[PDB]
Amino acid sequence: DPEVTLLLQCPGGGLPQEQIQAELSPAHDRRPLPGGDEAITAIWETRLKAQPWLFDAPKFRLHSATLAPIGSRGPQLLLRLGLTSYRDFLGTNWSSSAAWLRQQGATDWGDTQAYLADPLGVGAALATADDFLVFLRRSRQVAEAPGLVDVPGGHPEPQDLAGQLVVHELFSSVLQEICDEVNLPLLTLSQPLLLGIARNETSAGRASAEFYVQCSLTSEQVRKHYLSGGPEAHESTGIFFVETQNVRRLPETEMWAELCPSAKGAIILYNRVQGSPTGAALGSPALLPPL
Numbered sequence: 001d002p003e004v005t006l007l008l009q010c011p012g013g014g015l016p017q018e019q020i021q022a023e024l025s026p027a028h029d030r031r032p033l034p035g036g037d038e039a040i041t042a043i044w045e046t047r048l049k050a051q052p053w054l055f056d057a058p059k060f061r062l063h064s065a066t067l068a069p070i071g072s073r074g075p076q077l078l079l080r081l082g083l084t085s086y087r088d089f090l091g092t093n094w095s096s097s098a099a100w101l102r103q104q105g106a107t108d109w110g111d112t113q114a115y116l117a118d119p120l121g122v123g124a125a126l127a128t129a130d131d132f133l134v135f136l137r138r139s140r141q142v143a144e145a146p147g148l149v150d151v152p153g154g155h156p157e158p159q160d161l162a163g164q165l166v167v168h169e170l171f172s173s174v175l176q177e178i179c180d181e182v183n184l185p186l187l188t189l190s191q192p193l194l195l196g197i198a199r200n201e202t203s204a205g206r207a208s209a210e211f212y213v214q215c216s217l218t219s220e221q222v223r224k225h226y227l228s229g230g231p232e233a234h235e236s237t238g239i240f241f242v243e244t245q246n247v248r249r250l251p252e253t254e255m256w257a258e259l260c261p262s263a264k265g266a267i268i269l270y271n272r273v274q275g276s277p278t279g280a281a282l283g284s285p286a287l288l289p290p291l
């Protein structure tokens with residue numbers, strides 16, 4: 001899977017909101033392009049002159065994420081965040097020249113991402129009361145990953161002493177994206193746990209935070225809620241479910257070639273952090289079948 005890299009695997013089965021610190025700083029922003037940000041402005045002008053209904057929006061930028069020594073007391077993760085935008089994403093990560101920008105960043109800054117917008121995405125491994133994970137089929141008509149399989153998620157928009165409000169918006173945003181796309185009531189969802197962070201190498205290394213969320217509804221009840229919105233209530237074209245038993249070997253299935261990179265990140269981190277038991281009971285051969 002060359003199109004996905006793990007940047008962070010969380011300890012303890014995943015981190016709750018109260019264990020994460022954020023540092024939101026203009027030191028964590030993208031660097032101006034070598035020949036100037038006029039190249040971004042030109043791409044955006046060309047795009048608006050074909051699709052004038054498009055609009056810009058602010059986004060969080062991932063700079064880096066440092067985990068505490070394992071088993072320690074106190075805050076367990078520091079997220080270093082900057083600010084970026086949809087416009088800056090279209091002019092950098094989505095540019096035909098994105099690989100040239102990665103090489104230039106290595107040369108000038110010793111940082112392949114220095115000249116990239118790198119907006120932070122969120123995604124969920126969303127589990128049902130009857131032990132399935134939730135999958136969504138992407139429209140064949142959109143620009144990114146057309147016709148591929150995804151999990152619930154999105155790219156949160158801004159609004160430890162401004163830090164804690166930023167962590168709150170990240171955790172809030174993954175629940176809001178489940179409510180908006182899957183049409184589930186907020187009170188059927190658990191507080192999220194952060195499983196880790198994955199990078200999409202097909203989008204020049206932009207990162208997504210991947211979360212575990214439990215729903216109190218069965219797969220049949222989740223399907224009813226999704227469908228009862230009608231075609232205008234969701235961006236996806238269909239919903240489906242895979243038993244958690246079978247997610248263990250998903251990379252060996254024909255479904256794997258249909259998953260978009262950020263969804264592959266969610267399922268790798270689910271298998272490493274929530275799956276993969278460490279104790280004698282769940283590690284026994286009748287509960288953890290060999291192969």
Ligand SMILES: COC(=O)[C@@H]1C[C@@H](O)CN1C(=O)c1ccco1
Pocket residue numbers: 055056057086089119155
């Ligand atoms: C990195 O992902 C994105 O920027 C996606 C891509 C496209 O679907 C639009 N988009 C937004 O998030 C967006 C546009 C305006 C407000 O939000």
